[PDB]
RNA sequence: GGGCGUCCGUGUUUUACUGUGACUAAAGAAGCGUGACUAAAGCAGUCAUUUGACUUGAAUUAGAAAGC
RNA sequence: GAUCUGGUUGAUUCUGCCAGUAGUCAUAUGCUUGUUUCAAGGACUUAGCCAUGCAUGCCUCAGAAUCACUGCAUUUGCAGGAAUCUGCGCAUGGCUCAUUACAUCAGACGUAAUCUGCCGCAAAAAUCUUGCGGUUUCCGCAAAAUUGGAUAACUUGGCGAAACGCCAAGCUAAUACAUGAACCAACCGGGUGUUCUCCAGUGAGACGCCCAGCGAAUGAAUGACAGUAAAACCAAUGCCUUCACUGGCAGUAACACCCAGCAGUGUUGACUCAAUUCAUUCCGUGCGAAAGCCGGCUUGUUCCGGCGUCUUUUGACGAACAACUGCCCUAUCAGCUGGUGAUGGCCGUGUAGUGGACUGCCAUGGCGUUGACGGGAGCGGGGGAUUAGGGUUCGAUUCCGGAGAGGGAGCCUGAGAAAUAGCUACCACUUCUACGGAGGGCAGCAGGCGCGCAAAUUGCCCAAUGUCAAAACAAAACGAUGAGGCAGCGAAAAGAAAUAGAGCAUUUCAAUGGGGGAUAUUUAAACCCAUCCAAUAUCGAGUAACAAUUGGAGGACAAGUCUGGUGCCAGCACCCGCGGUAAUUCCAGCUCCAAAAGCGUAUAUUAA
RNA sequence: GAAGUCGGCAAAAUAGAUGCGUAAGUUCGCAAGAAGCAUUGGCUCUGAGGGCAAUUGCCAACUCAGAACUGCUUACGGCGGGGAAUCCAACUGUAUAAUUA
């Protein structure tokens, strides 16, 4: 009693547990970005609902009604941050249309195999764990950090590391 | 006849964490009211950071050393809740405790020769026994035979050092004025018209600078200077303005790049 | 004990209040201190801030005022005439706030006289001559003081002040009384 | 000589609805900022370069009905 | 993701329900578990019953020290101080949801209808005391007011089985209690002398006398004004003019000196209020400069400083009342209320105060199909689940508000109680006893029984957060605190993420933490996390035996026309339907499927 | 305290008046005085209830309610015990003068 700390669900189960074509779907991802489980995708699914639908509900407003600049432009702006869009689009509909790859392109396990310090996906999920990896200066064991776009020039390798 | 108060009920502004204490200190009855003060306790430990516990509360407090309106206060439950003037003499900081634009108090840095100085608003007019008048300021303070052209909703200038009424103000149309509570706290403007209303509140309708009308309950109306040129206390760095939301935050961000 | 709450009646449409609280302190009736002429007897209770207030069972002189003149003076009190909410109140001689009495008097006339000169120092006869001027005293009370009682009214509240203070009755009501008396 | 301010004396319109505005506890919900390694959280911290700096941050929104 | 699918027919198209699946800080239970971070945890059934332990007390430079107490001791004693009186608090916090539908609660108003300790700002000239001498127990001289008697601890005797059970007698303190202070010392008034000082009777002046303080009582006055501009006649009175009350309206706040302006004007929307004046009161049921304390001192017959307390007052923290709008299901509850208050009136009484709250009299009202009355389930809300939207549901539980301490009732003390780790009684239970008696109240925290589908340690600590308090810390000398915090137990929920990576035979190049351990870090202490395998110098994984499970494989629904066994048997199956001798469904083996340190099942609920 | 006895036969019991209260059944009329509870004296007062004559004055005859004080040895006569059911006749009435109502 009285320990007020709040948590939170970060996922949620989809309804209809087993259709061939998401299940399909699922597999397709799961072997591509090297994930240990479903629930790493239903994960993105739901921060990317949320990031989505609060653009719906902005959207359906007027222009220049002061939610829409002030709370429109902060999800416009973390999503060039992070580089779920490119820093081209600035429309606010972009948001609105975004996909699961988007945000798994910027989990820390693909791009440490996209930079190239391992061999597909399976290398770098366990190379990250194996406490190698360090994202600037600083060690991370999450193959789940999603790695801001300014930080994604200083990865290289720890120094306490073999590698350094 | 309550006496402990929650963190969760203790008011916002004091700005404790919810997690690290099931209690906030309560304070005790005083000159300035529960809901609207700070204690002397939050003061030192959590603005002024003179201390980094409660024990170091009354290390500090006890000794006395720690004076509001020139007396020294032992208490870390003694409510200091605006226009109050705290001086520490052993460092040698002087704070006028005025609220904050955004509703939040700010510790004003003030003179040695502007401390002398304390205004306080006036909330009642009566006759004591010998037709002595007083007034009641909304401090607390009960000043016997004050200005005769004081009414109530002027403030008193008050010399906390030698004890006395300096000049006063009253409050007519364009009269500098600091927003006392009410989602418009700390913002200062001139007073553009007052509404009538006998029998209820009366509605009173403010001009900050650079043009803007907002409206309080003329209860949280606090009367300073002739003009919004000329005030007779030192106001925070932002002096009455609100900035619009859209600009404080793009210059939280021009700012981040250092 | 007594209670003064609401909980024990019935609401305007007639159904029964459920309690579900206890009595409190806060809610109290002293039993009535039923006053009445005789030697001084006060029984002093304390009440809710630490304040007392005097029960008087049984005063008899008593504080009596005389309006149209701005006086009083301290007069026995003779006699419980009349009560206007039971008729028993008068034979049992109960002093209650809006009772009529019967007193002295007697002062009265040493006032009256001492004041006026007349009677029921060369510089202070024509004093008498100037408050004369002016000045006019109802037959109904001057023919009252030749028999030495006057009927008054007695103000204080009895039993919370623990003292019987009143007015003379005047010819506007004095005249409803001594009707409605006999 | 005319004109505002104040007070008093003598000789007719509301309400729903809508716009704006006051007035309203925190936790909770929505939300800004912030690499607690990420996240659920938190309201912190960040920086020089030391014998402090940022006037350091802790924004903001909704919250039936009724009442103004 | 505003989504639907299997079952009625020989087929068809419908209605239409059952069954399917997705949540749930929703609880239970079953099998299963390596590591971490933050969490609920005797509410649901009994507001059942409780063995034992703890759960509030507090003293500074500053209220009372011959402990026949411990230290030091060439000073009259100073340094601790055990108990004991005194002052404050125990009315808060904690727990719990039995009661409860114009009650409680929410938002919004109100107290001008009131009580308010502590806390802030302030107020303060009521008072014939004391000593010496005398003496009429009363004058007269004098001024730093040098007041009183009693109680506890304690000693002596002790009673009693015992007991938060008691009795005598003898000592002695106070900021306990009781008394009490004149001149210093002002201004302002009312009433009046068979008072004398004057000048002509609304005369003035002195002096004498009784009374003139805050607060309370009754009475009287004040608590403004506003709808008109000249004149003159009389008495007084002012002022001018004369010489004379002589002639006469120029002048202009008031007022018969000692004060020539020391109030001609309190506050509200509004008051019988604030305050002022006059008249009688106040007998304890109000009023000290605590006749109080320790510090300075450059110094003591007005040196100075910070505390303590009385009475008055008004802000503040509160208390208690009232109630504008709103709150579940029921008519197989339609009339409800007035004997003995029901709705209103009058004079009271009682209250802190308003009031049918209550006594006496008077009237006949008040409420109801826009659901009264009755009954059923319920603490109210902030909020939670789920939802495209609209909704449906939960809210015993952290915060606010209400109520209770086994059941009922009564009350003392106090500023505040109808208080229960306070008293008194009865009921139901129960614990000691020497038989005479004396006790108890866990819905405080641990823990026990019981009950049940259902819920942890008789653990450490005040380090933090608060509270009370005579209180800073330290210095011989660290207040209590089961409030609170910390760990134990803990797959309720929630986050992160191991069980291999690299170039089917093999073979071998690294890497890692589970775990071990540490100069240590952490913490009140210990934990856990983090940091670490040399920094001169310290561990280690290959069948990774350091070995992942729980439910399925006809359909809905993803995954076998495998192989055994059984023969409408045993069993599966939510629904449809399988099994009666080649079973895609049972029991098994292999094989694949979904989810995965998690996964089935039961009931409740939301979407469907 | 019905064990008596064929059987509560006989006796006891109940009892006036006023207020509150009153079940099943029913032909809605009753049942019903159902059942049951409570009050009662004496004394000293108070209120209400009218007539007549010209607001005022004078007068008769009683009843009811309320209060204070005080008392009970429960104390003339008179005056229902009540409730749950079965059988029969609907009811009031008549009827074996002198064994049957």
Known sequence: ????????????????????????????????????????????????????????????????????????????????EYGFLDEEKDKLDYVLSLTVPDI??????????????????????????????????????????????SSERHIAFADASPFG | AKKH??????????????????????????????????????????????????????????????????????????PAGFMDVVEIPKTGDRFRLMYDVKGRFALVSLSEAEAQIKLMKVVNLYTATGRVPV??????????????????????????KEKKCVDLIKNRQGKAVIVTGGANRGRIGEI????????????????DASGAEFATRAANIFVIGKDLNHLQVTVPKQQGLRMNVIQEREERLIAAEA | GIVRSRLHKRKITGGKTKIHRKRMKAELGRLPANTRLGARRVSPVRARGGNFKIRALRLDTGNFAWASEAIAHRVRLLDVVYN?????????????????VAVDAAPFKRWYAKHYGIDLSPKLQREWIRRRRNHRVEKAIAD???????????????????????????????????????
Not at chain 1, 24 to 41: H, N, P, S, V
Request: charged share 30%.
């Open chain 1, 1 to 80: 009693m009285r320990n007020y700390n709040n948590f939170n669900r970060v996922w949620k189960a989809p309804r209809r547990p087993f259709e061939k074509e998401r299940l399909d779907r699922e597999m397709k991802l799961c072997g591509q970005y090297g994930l240990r489980c479903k629930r790493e995708i239903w994960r993105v699914n739901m921060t990317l609902s949320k990031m989505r639908r609060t653009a719906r509900l902005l959207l359906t407003l007027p222009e220049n009604h002061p939610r829409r600049l002030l709370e429109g432009s902060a999800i416009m702006r973390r999503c060039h």
């Open chain 1, 104 to 149: 798994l392109e910027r989990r820390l396990q693909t791009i440490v195999f996209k930079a190239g310090l391992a061999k597909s996906v399976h290398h770098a999920r366990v190379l990250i764990q194996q406490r190698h990896i360090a994202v600037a200066k600083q060690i991370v064991t999450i193959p789940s950090f999603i790695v801001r776009v």
């Open chain 2, 5 to 78: 108060l929650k963190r969760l009920y203790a008011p916002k502004d004091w700005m404790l964490s919810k997690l690290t204490g099931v209690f906030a200190p309560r304070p005790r009855p005083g000159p300035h009211k529960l809901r609207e003060c700070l204690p002397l306790l939050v003061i030192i430990r959590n603005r002024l950071k003179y201390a980094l516990n409660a024990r170091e509360g009354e290390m500090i407090l006890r000794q006395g050393l720690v004076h509001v309106d020139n007396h020294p206060r032992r208490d870390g439950k003694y």
């Open chain 2, 135 to 160: 007034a009641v300021t909304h401090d607390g303070h009960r000043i016997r035979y004050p200005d005769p052209h004081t009414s109530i909703g002027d403030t008193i200038v008050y010399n906390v």
């Open chain 2, 192 to 207: 553009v018209k007052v509404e009538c209303h006998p029998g209820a509140f009366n509605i009173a309708h403010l001009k």
């Open chain 3, 84 to 100: 206007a909410t039971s008729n028993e109140l008068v034979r049992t001689k109960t002093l209650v706030k809006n009772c009529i």
């Open chain 3, 144 to 182: 009252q003081l030749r028999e030495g009682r006057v009927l008054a009214r007695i103000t204080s509240r009895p039993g919370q002040s623990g003292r019987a203070d009143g007015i003379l009755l005047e010819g506007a009501e004095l005249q409803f009384y001594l009707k409605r008396l006999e």
